[PDB]
Structure formats: structure tokens, C-alpha cells
Amino acid sequence: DCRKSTYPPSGPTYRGPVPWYTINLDLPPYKRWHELMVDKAPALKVIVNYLKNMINAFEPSGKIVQLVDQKLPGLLGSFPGPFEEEMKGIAAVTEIPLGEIILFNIFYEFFTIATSIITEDKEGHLLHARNMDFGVFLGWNVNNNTWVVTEELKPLTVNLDFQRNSKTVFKAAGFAGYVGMLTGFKPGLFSLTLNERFSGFMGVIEWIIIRSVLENSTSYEEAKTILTKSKILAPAYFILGGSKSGEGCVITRDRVQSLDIYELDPKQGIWYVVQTNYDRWKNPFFLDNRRTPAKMCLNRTTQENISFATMYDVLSTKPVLNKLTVYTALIDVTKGQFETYLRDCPDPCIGW
Ligand SMILES: *[C@@H]1O[C@H](CO[C@@H]2O[C@@H](C)[C@@H](O)[C@@H](O)[C@@H]2O)[C@@H](O[C@@H]2O[C@H](CO)[C@@H](O)[C@H](O)[C@H]2NC(C)=O)[C@H](O)[C@H]1NC(C)=O
Ligand SMILES: *[C@@H]1O[C@H](CO)[C@@H](O[C@@H]2O[C@H](CO)[C@@H](O)[C@H](O)[C@H]2NC(C)=O)[C@H](O)[C@H]1NC(C)=O
Numbered sequence: 068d069c070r071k072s073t074y075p076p077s078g079p080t081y082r083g084p085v086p087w088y089t090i091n092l093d094l095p096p097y098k099r100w101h102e103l104m105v106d107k108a109p110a111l112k113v114i115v116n117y118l119k120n121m122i123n124a125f126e127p128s129g130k131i132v133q134l135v136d137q138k139l140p141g142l143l144g145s146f147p148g149p150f151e152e153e154m155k156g157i158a159a160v161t162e163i164p165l166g167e168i169i170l171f172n173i174f175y176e177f178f179t180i181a182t183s184i185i186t187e188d189k190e191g192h193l194l195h196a197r198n199m200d201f202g203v204f205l206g207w208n209v210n211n212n213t214w215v216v217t218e219e220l221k222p223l224t225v226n227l228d229f230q231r232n233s234k235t236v237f238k239a240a241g242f243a244g245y246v247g248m249l250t251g252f253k254p255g256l257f258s259l260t261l262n263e264r265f266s267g268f269m270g271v272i273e274w275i276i277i278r279s280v281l282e283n284s285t286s287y288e289e290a291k292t293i294l295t296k297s298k299i300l301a302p303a304y305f306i307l308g309g310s311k312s313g314e315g316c317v318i319t320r321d322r323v324q325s326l327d328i329y330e331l332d333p334k335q336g337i338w339y340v341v342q343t344n345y346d347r348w349k350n351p352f353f354l355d356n357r358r359t360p361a362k363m364c365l366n367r368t369t370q371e372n373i374s375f376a377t378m379y380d381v382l383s384t385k386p387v388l389n390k391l392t393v394y395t396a397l398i399d400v401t402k403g404q405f406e407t408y409l410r411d412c413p414d415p416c417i418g419w
Contacts, residue, residue: 069360069363069364069367069368069380069381069384070364070380070381070383070384071380072380073376073379073380073383074375074376074377074379074380075376076379076408079411079413080383080388080410080411080412080413081408081409081410081411082221082408082409082410082411083408083409084407084408084409085224085225085226085240085394085407085408085409086225086226087225087226087227087228088102088103088225088226088227088228089227089228089229089230090103090227090228090229090230091230091231091232092229092230092231092236092282093230093231093232095152096148096149096150096151096152096153096156097152097153097155097156097159098156099153099156100153100156100157100160100243100244100246101156101160103225103243104157104160104161104243104244105160107161107222107223107243107244108160108161108162108163110219110220110222110223111161111163111171111223111243111244112161112163113216113219114171114216114219114220114223114244115163115167115168115170115171117202117212117213117216118131118170118171118174118175118178119131119132119170120210120212121178121204121208121210122174124210125204125205125208126272131170132166132167132170134272134275135166135169135170135173135275136164136166138275139165139166139169142169142173142275143169150172150246153246154168154169154172154246157244157246161244168244171244171245172244172245172246172247173271173275174271175242175245175247176249176261176263176301176303177204177205177263177268177271177301178201178202178203178204179199179200179201179203179249179263180200180203180206180262180263180343180344180419181197181198181199181200181249181260181262181263181343181344182197182198182341182342182343182357182358182361182382182387183195183196183197183260183262183304183306183341183342183343184196184197184339184340184341184342184361184365184378184381184382185306185308185315185317185331185339185340186338186339186340186365186370186373186378187312187313187315187331187333187338187339187370188338188370188373188374189370189371191312191313191333192312192399192401193258193308193309193310193312193314193315193331193399193400193401194308194373194374194375194378194397194398194399195252195258195260195306195308195397195398195399195400196378196379196381196382196395196396196397196398197250197260197306197395197396198382198387198388198392198394198395198396198410199240199249199250199392199393199394199396200217200389200391200392200393200419201216201217201220201391201393202214202216202217202220202391203391203419205265205268206263206265206344206354207354209418213391213418214390214391214418217391217393220242220393221393221394221409223242223243223244224240224241224242224393224394224407224409225240225241225242225243226238226239226240226241226405226407227239227240227241227248229281229282235254236253236281236282237251237252237253237254237281237282238251238252238253238254238405239251239252239281240394240396240407246278247277247278248277248278248281249261249277250396251277251278251281252281252308252398252400252405253281253284253400254400254403255310255400255401255403256284256285256286256287256290256309256310256400257284257286257287257290257307257308257309257310257314257400258307258308258309258398258400259277259280259281259290259294259305259306259307259308260305260306260396261277261303261304261305261306262303262304262306262342262343262344263301263303263304263344264301264302264303264304264319264320264344264346265302265344266302266321267301267302268301270300270301270322271300271301274300276293276294276297276299279293280293280294287307287309287310287311287314290307291307291316291318294307294318294320295318295320295325295328296325298322298323299320299322300322301322302319302320302321302322303320304317304318304319304320304342304344305317305318305320306318306340306342308398308400309400310400310401313330313331313332313333315330315331315340316328316329316330316331317329317340317342317347319346319347326346327346327347327348329347333370338370338373339362339365339370339373341358341361341362341365342358343355343357343358343361345358356386356417357386357387357389357419360384360385360386360387361381361382361384361387364380364381364384364387365381368380368381375397375399375404375406378397379395379397382395383395385412385416385417386417386419388410388412388416389412389416389417389418389419390412390416390417390418390419391418391419392410392412392419393409393410394407394408394409394410395407395408395410396408
């Protein structure tokens with residue numbers, strides 16, 4: 068049964084709060100991540116090495132960095148101007164080869180599963196919350212080092228305030244060394260989270276957005292048209308929450324088109340949406356064990372009682388909370404609230 072009285076965070080499931088850093092976009096891209104990357108190269112090397120070994124194990128024929136590295140020069144030009152220089156700055160501070168920073172930035176998404184939730188209270192105001200796990204590759208694969216690596220990643224979790232001099236452009240939950248983001252919001256406009264979709268990974272290999280929307284989109288409408296129509300490297304689920312009552316949708320994407328766009332409709336009894344890493348119309352497999360208990364616990368909460376505290380209760384209930392859960396994030400776009408908490412799951416707790 069669902070957890071209760073878990074907010075404000077305390078106890079063994081609470082690893083601590085996520086530190087805040089300001090990223091000044093007025094600075095030259097090369098310098099933006101300098102302060103953040105201090106003293107983080109050792110941990111980041113552990114993460115990068117983990118990605119390599121998992122990719123090599125998944126495709127024993129070839130070595131991944133060989134291909135990225137040998138195909139690297141072309142990749143740099145493929146990137147928009149700022150990202151290349153931001154990554155070179157990261158490589159310099161950390162003394163990590165540029166190719167490995169790029170490998171980390173390209174493939175990080177494929178090692179994340181998440182539970183993303185949008186809800187609307189009777190007042191008509193949206194809450195956006197998310198539990199993020201790390202280490203599970205393509206939604207099912209792990210190795211005997213996954214748990215050690217995930218614990219090493221938690222100190223890299225950071226809340227980022229992207230600013231233009233002294234004005235906040237957008238806020239995000241991210242990871243030092245990763246210049247992209249899978250969780251962010253623009254105060255008073257919209258919130259956005261990305262869940263990985265597995266249908267894909269070869270496409271990236273064959274080939275070898277959230278930031279751009281957060282940085283330059285001026286409205287929920289604009290972000291929606293970009294997220295629905297723009298081409299993307301791999302399939303994904305976009306969970307987009309707005310400020311206005313009823314501005315909440317889940318976009319299921321493939322490389323080229325939106326396979327489904329599903330909106331909240333509290334008038335017709337749909338006051339929440341729970342998106343994990345499988346298509347919501349399909350039936351869940353044995354491995355998809357997170358969405359149903361979340362829906363079960365939201366149903367018991369009722370729209371009347373939905374809040375930060377009751378939302379945190381849902382995201383503190385196993386298996387929604389699990390051993391590989393890195394952080395819990397709570398967002399209220401209208402009021403500008405953005406809370407992120409590191410998590411633990413003491414035994415007995417399932418991996419994911
Ligand atoms: C994860 O496993 C690797 C591989 O080691 C083998 O598998 C283990 C389950 C165990 O049975 C080992 O005895 C096996 O040899 C571990 O890598 C080894 O680490 C130590 C160094 O401290 C040593 O045994 C070897 O140098 C390593 N072997 C290889 C092939 O690299 C690794 O330590 C395991 N991780 C954890 C967290 O235990
Ligand atoms: C968000 O928009 C700003 C301006 O709208 C972008 O800044 C430009 O980025 C281009 C490439 O996208 C660079 O070549 C230019 O140097 C930048 N121009 C200015 C005037 O700063 C910004 O790049 C966009 N978002 C991201 C993530 O790059």
C-alpha cells in the first residue's frame with residue numbers, strides 16, 4: 068500500500084538535497100561549466116567507463132569509443148556552435164578526452180528510466196513530478212557494477228539555474244558533464260521532462276532539443292509544436308506541463324513523427340497522467356512494474372488531495388521508488404517551485 072507522511076523529506080529514503088549552480092549564458096560557452104566541473108572528473112570517469120562497457124557488452128563486435136572517436140570530427144560540426152565549445156570546456160576542466168565527454172552526452176539518455184507524472188488539482192493548477200533512475204540500459208540491462216556506478220552518480224546531480232546575466236531563463240535538473248537536460252521548466256510558461264522510449268539505439272549508432280526549447284521557446288504552444296514535429300535522434304516520450312488550466316500533454320514520439328499526443332481532461336475525469344517507459348495504450352509487461360502502483364496511489368489520493376506532499380508520497384512508494392532511483396523532482400510552473408531530492412531505498416527494495 069501507498070506511503071504517507073513522507074513530506075517534507077526525511078529518513079532513510081532521503082539522501083539529501085540537490086545543490087544549486089547558476090549557468091551564466093552571457094559567459095563564453097567554453098567557460099560556462101567550469102565552476103560546476105570542479106573536483107568531479109573522478110566520478111565522471113567512472114560513469115563514462117560504465118557506458119563504454121555496457122555498450123561494448125551489448126555489441127561485442129566493435130569498441131564504441133573507437134567508432135565515436137574515429138567518427139568524432141564529423142560529430143563536432145554536427146553540433147550547434149555552443150555545445151561543442153561547452154563540451155571542450157568540460158573536457159579541459161576534467162582532463163577527460165573530448166570523445167568521451169561526447170560519448171557521455173550522446174548516450175546518457177539510453178541509461179535512464181523514469182516515472183513522470185502531471186496532475187491538475189480542482190483549482191486547475193498543474194504539478195509536474197518525476198522519479199529518475201540511472202544504470203538500466205535500454206530499459207532492462209544492467210551488470211554487476213550498476214549499483215556502484217549509480218551511487219557514484221548521485222553527487223553529480225545538480226539543479227541548474229540558466230541565466231542571462233541576472234535574469235533566469237530556465238531551470239533544470241541535470242548532471243555535471245551533461246550539457247543537455249531531461250528535466251526543466253520556464254517559470255510561468257511550461258515544464259518538460261523526457262522519458263526514454265525503447266522500440267532507436269542503432270539509429271544513433273547508424274547516425275554516428277530539450278535544451279533549445281527550454282532556452283528559446285517563449286510559450287507552451289511553441290514548445291509543443293517543436294516537440295511534436297521536430298526530428299529527433301531516438302524515440303522518446305515528452306511530458307509537457309503548462310501554466311494555464313488544462314495545458315498538459317504526453318507526446319509519444321518516434322524519430323520523425325508523433326505517434327500519440329494525449330491531453331489532460333479533468334472535466335472528463337482524467338486529472339493525471341503517468342508516463343513510464345512503455346506506450347500507455349499497450350499492456351505492461353512483467354518488467355513494467357512502476358506505472359500501475361503510481362496510478363493506484365494517485366487514485367487513492369484523489370484529485371481533492373493532490374499536492375507536493377501527496378505527490379512525494381506516491382514517488383516514495385516501492386517500486387515507484389527503487390534502488391536505482393537517483394532523485395525525485397517536484398515542479399509547480401505557475402508558482403515557480405522546483406524541488407529536487409536525492410533518494411535511497413533501503414532493503415528490502417527491488418532494483419527497478
Ligand atoms: C564485477 O565483476 C568483475 C569481474 O570479476 C568476476 O566476476 C565477479 C562476479 C567475481 O566472481 C570475480 O571474482 C570474477 O573474477 C569484477 O572485476 C574484478 O575485480 C577485481 C579487482 O579488484 C579482480 O577480481 C579482477 O581484477 C576483476 N576482474 C575483471 C575481469 O576485470 C568487479 O570487481 C565486480 N564488481 C563488484 C562491484 O564486485
Ligand atoms: C537559444 O537561442 C539563442 C539565441 O536565440 C542561441 O544563441 C545562438 O546559438 C547559435 C547556434 O544555435 C550560435 O551559433 C550563436 O553564437 C548564438 N547567438 C547568440 C545571439 O547568442 C542559443 O544557441 C539557442 N540555444 C542553444 C541551446 O544553443
